[PDB]
Design an enzyme around this catalytic site. Structure first.
Site, PDB file in Angstrom:
ATOM      1  N   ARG A   1      27.435  45.700  40.643  1.00 17.43           N
ATOM      2  CA  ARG A   1      27.120  44.290  40.460  1.00 17.43           C
ATOM      3  C   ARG A   1      27.580  43.452  41.648  1.00 17.43           C
ATOM      4  O   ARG A   1      27.014  42.399  41.925  1.00 17.43           O
ATOM      5  CB  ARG A   1      27.726  43.762  39.160  1.00 17.43           C
TER       6      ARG A   1
ATOM      7  N   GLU B   1      38.508  47.007  32.919  1.00 20.39           N
ATOM      8  CA  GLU B   1      38.797  46.454  31.597  1.00 20.39           C
ATOM      9  C   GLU B   1      38.437  47.425  30.473  1.00 20.39           C
ATOM     10  O   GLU B   1      39.168  47.535  29.489  1.00 20.39           O
ATOM     11  CB  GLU B   1      38.071  45.127  31.374  1.00 20.39           C
TER      12      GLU B   1
HETATM   13  O1  PRP Z   1      38.650  43.795  37.104  1.00 21.16           O
HETATM   14  P1  PRP Z   1      38.291  45.089  36.419  1.00 21.16           P
HETATM   15  O2  PRP Z   1      39.007  45.310  35.108  1.00 21.16           O
HETATM   16  O3  PRP Z   1      38.298  46.298  37.323  1.00 21.16           O
HETATM   17  O4  PRP Z   1      36.745  44.898  35.991  1.00 21.16           O
HETATM   18  C1  PRP Z   1      35.788  44.302  36.870  1.00 21.16           C
HETATM   19  C2  PRP Z   1      34.752  45.320  37.349  1.00 21.16           C
HETATM   20  O5  PRP Z   1      34.120  46.016  36.263  1.00 21.16           O
HETATM   21  C3  PRP Z   1      32.698  45.834  36.308  1.00 21.16           C
HETATM   22  O6  PRP Z   1      32.045  46.915  36.986  1.00 21.16           O
HETATM   23  P2  PRP Z   1      31.511  48.222  36.207  1.00 21.16           P
HETATM   24  O7  PRP Z   1      32.510  49.330  36.425  1.00 21.16           O
HETATM   25  O8  PRP Z   1      31.142  47.825  34.796  1.00 21.16           O
HETATM   26  O9  PRP Z   1      30.180  48.682  37.001  1.00 21.16           O
HETATM   27  P3  PRP Z   1      28.885  47.792  37.383  1.00 21.16           P
HETATM   28  O10 PRP Z   1      29.328  46.931  38.540  1.00 21.16           O
HETATM   29  O11 PRP Z   1      27.876  48.848  37.758  1.00 21.16           O
HETATM   30  O12 PRP Z   1      28.534  47.023  36.132  1.00 21.16           O
HETATM   31  C4  PRP Z   1      32.489  44.570  37.123  1.00 21.16           C
HETATM   32  O13 PRP Z   1      31.209  44.571  37.767  1.00 21.16           O
HETATM   33  C5  PRP Z   1      33.635  44.620  38.109  1.00 21.16           C
HETATM   34  O14 PRP Z   1      33.257  45.386  39.261  1.00 21.16           O
HETATM   35  N1  ADE Z   2      34.468  41.146  30.328  1.00 21.45           N
HETATM   36  C1  ADE Z   2      33.575  41.565  31.291  1.00 21.45           C
HETATM   37  N2  ADE Z   2      32.301  41.051  31.380  1.00 21.45           N
HETATM   38  C2  ADE Z   2      31.445  41.484  32.323  1.00 21.45           C
HETATM   39  N3  ADE Z   2      31.774  42.417  33.231  1.00 21.45           N
HETATM   40  C3  ADE Z   2      33.028  42.968  33.182  1.00 21.45           C
HETATM   41  N4  ADE Z   2      33.593  43.936  33.978  1.00 21.45           N
HETATM   42  C4  ADE Z   2      34.855  44.121  33.515  1.00 21.45           C
HETATM   43  N5  ADE Z   2      35.095  43.306  32.455  1.00 21.45           N
HETATM   44  C5  ADE Z   2      33.986  42.577  32.238  1.00 21.45           C
HETATM   45 MG    MG Z   3      31.217  46.300  38.958  1.00 20.56          MG
END
Ligand code: PRP
Ligand code: ADE
Ligand code: MG
Ligand code: PRP
Ligand code: ADE
Ligand code: MG
Lengths: 179, 177
Positions: A66, A103
């Site tokens: 993302r 998270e």
């Molecule tokens: O601060 P944190 O607890 O590490 O969470 C934040 C991260 O988690 C999500 O990525 P995800 O691993 O869901 O992959 P994506 O980017 O493909 O959605 C989001 O896009 C952040 O990169």
């Molecule tokens: N609460 C949340 N919403 C969207 N993206 C996330 N990536 C990690 N935590 C998230």
């Molecule tokens: Mg991510």
């Protein structure tokens, strides 16, 4: 209250209990779908980085996946290249990798060994900061390459999860803060 | 020479991620601002020329598609919709399984991503077998969107991806066997 920040905020939507019970998921999709909103987000981030670093940035680093949505546009805005930090197994050639938790699960990030030369100045961008595990892993890898991480930025910050403090003393900046 | 700025910034790695694949690395295009700008500009000018003011949205394919989608959309004054790997998007969704060059996968889209009739151009970084892009078209088809064209930076012509999308128009900046 900055109207530019409102254009972004108005396009965040929330889903409870996704992808797992007790998570309040912030959906950025509407920001991307509204060109006015996306433009505002990139502009706000760029303005901050321009004022805070005076152009002394070599690369933006975008976080799979993302973070990919904002990285290139932000880099282009600033006249900079964008380096990719990816989920493990996605990048070719020699790499470094690190495990971390976010998270709602755990994962491993990775970077190509020749992504940056020692001393090169980087700003890390992702869509959302939560626990800060993902960003911290990114900072750890950039550190292995002897890059200087100047700052980490996101659109959204979930302040109850204390991600900011986990990143210290690397500076952090977000557009929007929720609990 | 704008095209040559893009051409010069593709690297190749044999047998990644598995034996029998020659992996084209787009990282250098992203890393060189002039290269990336040339690419977006070439894509945008092609689409404006081909579709005039008839495109409603760009759709970018998770994950590497995300690198180009939003930039291309912004260049054209359009929004970007997300087509993600299954499991990643909140809310009601449609999904579809498919094969790509070096594995199997599943894409997903939010049910409210698009309204019937709305016209979309799909963007991804690279076209190989065409399985990914086809799966994306299927998902858009289920929302009754009109897919005007698919585009990518790189096309691997020996894998016949273009034929799997036919008769949907396809355009790529770079071609390799
Ligand atoms: O601060 P944190 O607890 O590490 O969470 C934040 C991260 O988690 C999500 O990525 P995800 O691993 O869901 O992959 P994506 O980017 O493909 O959605 C989001 O896009 C952040 O990169
Ligand atoms: N609460 C949340 N919403 C969207 N993206 C996330 N990536 C990690 N935590 C998230
Ligand atoms: Mg991510
Ligand atoms: O034409 P095909 O045979 O479908 O292959 C092309 C697709 O495969 C790759 O994605 P991948 O599934 O490796 O995920 P990524 O985008 O996260 O790298 C690439 O980014 C294209 O989307
Ligand atoms: N040969 C290849 N190189 C880079 N990305 C790809 N995605 C599917 N096939 C690929
Ligand atoms: Mg892909």
């Amino acid at each position: 209250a900055d109207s530019e920040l409102q254009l972004v905020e108005q396009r965040i939507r929330s889903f409870p209990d996704f992808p797992t019970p007790g998570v309040v998921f912030r959906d950025i999709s509407p920001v991307l779908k509204d060109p006015a909103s996306f433009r505002a987000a990139i502009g706000l981030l760029a303005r901050h980085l321009k004022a805070t670093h005076g152009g002394r940035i070599d690369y933006i680093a975008g976080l799979d996946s993302r973070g990919f949505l904002f990285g290139p546009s932000l880099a282009q805005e600033l006249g900079l290249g964008c380096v990719l930090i990816r989920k493990r197994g996605k990048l070719p050639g020699p790499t470094l990798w690190a495990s971390y938790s976010l998270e709602y699960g755990k994962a491993e990030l990775e970077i190509q060994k020749d992504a940056l030369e020692p001393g090169q100045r980087v700003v890390v961008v992702d869509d959302l900061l939560a626990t800060g595990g993902t960003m911290n892993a990114a900072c750890e890898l950039l550190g292995r390459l002897q890059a200087e991480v100047l700052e980490c930025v996101s659109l959204v910050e979930l302040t109850s999860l204390k991600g900011r403090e986990k990143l210290a003393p690397v500076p952090f900046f977000s557009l929007l803060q929720y609990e």
